[PDB]
Chain length 149, copies 6
């Protein structure tokens, strides 16, 4: 079953939005299989944003993502990748639509409180990078039959 | 005044979303004139979904709507039919936008928690099939003057 | 299994608290087995307040519950009667504690938005008085094993 | 960052007060991340209402429009932030609540154009204009938000 | 019935504004069923804060309290209702948030006495005194609630 | 007198995950104003469960406690704050959800002792013991809260 990586950025923790963001995906109906408050070491952050090493904002990006603890999450479900992206909203919170996480709870791209894998491949890549295999938990949801036929 | 039929499907009851769904329409400003937890008979389910009788998924649909009690609702208000449809969201919860009932609380078409009449006449037709004579309660809202000029 | 009668009074409907009240019991973990919006006839009201027919406030009590539609409910669960009473709060909303329904959402005894049976005996009695044959719905809750050992 | 911070006027109309939506509407903007710098419950005089709805004085709904906005107290607000004018308009939704999208204030909480509970300046210029019209000298409160560094670079 | 509608002063302290709880606190009283008749974000002048806490002027913590209550804007409020003074006190909870019971504002949202988010008049006499001190005569807005007949008999 | 910052272990039992209450529980403590310094979805190894419930090892139901806590994933948390241990117990409510008061986690969300959703350390000593037991040595995350000065003097 498809999985995706969702991460509450440092500003989300500082603003006390961890529970609220988790609740949005819980209420949606997806299965949480990985969760941890984590202090991202610089090298791991730089590997995540590897493709942007040549960009002028790279230094700022790394400083930001390591400026405080983040909350790493892995969610499972059919279509979870695209759905999570939709629930999170556009990159720029000002443009993100009301109803989405960034559209309801953020005002600037550089402090857009949360991240979601943009594709199933990046979903697997990110979960493998941020989590240590033994950290994911498998379980049978009692409401499974009522969330999907 | 225009009326529409809104129903919380079996999965909504099992997931304890009855109150939450009702509140969405109450807060919106529409008038609740009919409400009841009901055990849908195969016969009624087949008459309701007659526009899908020839479909291959028709059988699974009938047994699903009868897989548990449902919550029948009749709401009143100018433009309530189209408005409820909008608040409910696209048939496929994965595609329904965040902010709508399905977009916020469901993940699969076969378990999309709620139904809303698609047109005024169908609203009239559905209320007639699901509710009995004096089962509907007509009343005048104290806030009427503040919701409609 | 123990059952209790809970009713949103006319003022609860007028103030749009139907969904909110239902959610409180849904979230608590009890099972909704009966629900309906209903316009209470004078005679049935007087029946409900049988033992208070000699009271000075009897006539006021009767007009109040018949001044608008009410939402009748039947909830099932171990200790649901006493628990429902605790969730509802003191008779006088001013005295009811914050966190309870009346303590959070009402301001006067004469408009205390909701009612709950005061004993298992009155629970059976009240459900038998307000609900007719076949109106109650029994079902097996998917989360039953997670609400009770 | 050198982004330009602007201000917008947001007002809870009489119907918003009657329906007890003041706190809920304020929370939407507070939770969004913008800064509240002006707030007051206010009874709008006919004069101010007409000066505010000047570009509609010729309309047929103007008479009722004025009586509507002065039919009870409103809650005046001034919010600060980068892109707050356009953002507020997005959070509020289409003029007609029936068409406003779920998630927006009017999309979630109103049912008719004439009773669409809230207003937000349509442009940075009208933002300055409206704030200057509804708020008196010294009513606005400037302050430094503790979370400023967490809402904007 | 014929009951006495009193008024009480409720103020969201500087910490409530910094934590973005203005809307949330207002909603608790709106949802309870009381009537908001006065509201304004306000930067409390030092003298006014000293008059408000006049009875504590000799205390060792007084200088620090005045400095604190003037360290950021507050939100002044006037609420009306039968028994609103005692009810507001109950809804707010004990002075020490750690001891305040879950369900109350302080019990749910604060952790320390010095930063307990909101204040409510402790008596009707103080409600009158406080409203008279923080609000200018013409700032209060009286109105008739459409739901009046549904909140009280 | 002034007390030191304290730490407590709060755990969402298997029933909390199954019911999708993880976010809701976290929010109660976040909203309260305490600092989250440890969090993880975890599959409890039997040896750890035994140490956790060591004080009840002589109880006839000890086996049941171990089996249940190891039957499905749990969510481990470490929270910091002055008086956080007693406060968390208060927010959680009485062991029997039927007796727990409305406003508390168990009072609002549970109906049976065996399925009472969450656990909070019963003493500061046990808070430190449990945090060291459930979290690996490098799993805690320390940080300076931007709102610190607004939550406590």
């Amino acid at each position: 079953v498809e999985e995706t990586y969702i991460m509450v950025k440092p500003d989300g923790i500082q603003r006390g939005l961890v529970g609220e963001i988790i609740s949005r995906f819980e209420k949606k109906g997806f299965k949480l299989i990985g969760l941890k408050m984590f202090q991202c070491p610089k090298e791991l952050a730089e590997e995540h944003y590897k493709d942007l090493s040549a960009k002028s904002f790279f230094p700022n990006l790394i400083e930001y993502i390591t400026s405080g603890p983040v909350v790493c999450m892995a969610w499972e479900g059919v279509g979870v990748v695209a759905s999570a992206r939709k629930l999170i909203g556009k990159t720029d919170p000002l443009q993100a639509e009301p109803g989405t996480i960034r559209g309801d709870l953020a005002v600037q791209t550089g402090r857009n409180i949360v991240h979601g894998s943009d594709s199933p491949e990046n979903g697997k890549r990110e979960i493998g990078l941020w989590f240590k295999e033994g950290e994911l938990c498998k379980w049978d949801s009692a409401l499974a039959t009522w969330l999907r036929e």
